[PDB]
Amino acid sequence: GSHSMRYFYTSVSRPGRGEPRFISVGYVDDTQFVRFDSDAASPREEPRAPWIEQEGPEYWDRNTQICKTNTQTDRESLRNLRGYYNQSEAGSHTLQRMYGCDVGPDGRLLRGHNQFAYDGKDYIALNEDLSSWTAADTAAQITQRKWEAARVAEQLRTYLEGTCVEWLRRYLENGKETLQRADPPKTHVTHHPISDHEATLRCWALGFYPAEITLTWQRDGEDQTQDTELVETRPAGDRTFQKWAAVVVPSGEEQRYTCHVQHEGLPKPLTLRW
């Protein structure tokens, strides 16, 4: 199906405790493949997936160099942002960036991404046209003006439509045995008496990849959206994910409830009962 590559940058200032720490991680879909940490004894872009290891020294040297430059640029940005908001040098602040590309089954660019957040709030984003910006406030407008004058959007467009998609395609091929393999959820229902009057039915999905999944409870064929407890999808630690959905049911009425599971690893959606 469709695929994505994403880089996630986080820089956090820490007045009195050195310069802002820069962390970078790279993902293809739900699989991390690289990491960089400016606090590391010897900061280097490092492999986090088996299929990226085959890349040569030039790859690792070039990407390390880019990460080191980005470490410095983020520190400049943090200084600028502090000023844009009239903030003191005493506080700690966070700058986040995510960027990358989405491709369809034919490897064609679907969409490009490039956006930033400051202290957890959206700050500025490259629009889907890859040619204009959306600024959240008057501070981000300053950034926008700078980047328009420097024609940053055009440079990003070139990267997103070229380099980004080319690397994603390469990664998808080199790691095809995993990246292009959907692992279906292993599903079952458990029953947990609460009292004489009711019990919990919990629908489980385990060992699935990618993370995207839909679990729903129906009663008499009606979705129980408002009455269903859904936990956040969580990593098992072996590349796969887990999730459950639970409803509280009247004792003896269990058979009126059905769990429905959708996942790209499944030919047809599953229906489960206690």
Partner: protein, 99 residues
């Protein structure tokens, strides 16, 4: 703005007393990123706990997985202790093999 962490404690595989497994503490939806996470065995901190590289979700909130190899039993109690700027006191979440 600050966001308090969601916390899930669970095992990689279905729990089987006497069989080696992995204990996970998944913290997410938090901001800022500085966070302290301990895994506990019967109230005491487990040494050698590893964690994932810092990443974040579409809403910019951070997530991390802390994990350690463990062999569950009938008696032994496991838990995850989390501290964050949003918390007036460390939060303790006990491992329930049914969740």
């Amino acid at each position: 703005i600050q966001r308090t962490p969601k916390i899930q404690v669970y095992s990689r595989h279905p729990a089987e007393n006497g069989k080696s497994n992995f204990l996970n503490c998944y913290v997410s939806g938090f901001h800022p990123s500085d966070i302290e996470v301990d895994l506990l065995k019967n109230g005491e901190r487990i040494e050698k706990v590893e964690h994932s590289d810092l990443s974040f979700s579409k809403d910019w909130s951070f997530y991390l997985l802390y994990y350690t190899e463990f062999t569950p039993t009938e008696k032994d109690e496991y838990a995850c202790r989390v501290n964050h700027v949003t918390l007036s006191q460390p939060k303790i979440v006990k491992w329930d093999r049914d969740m």
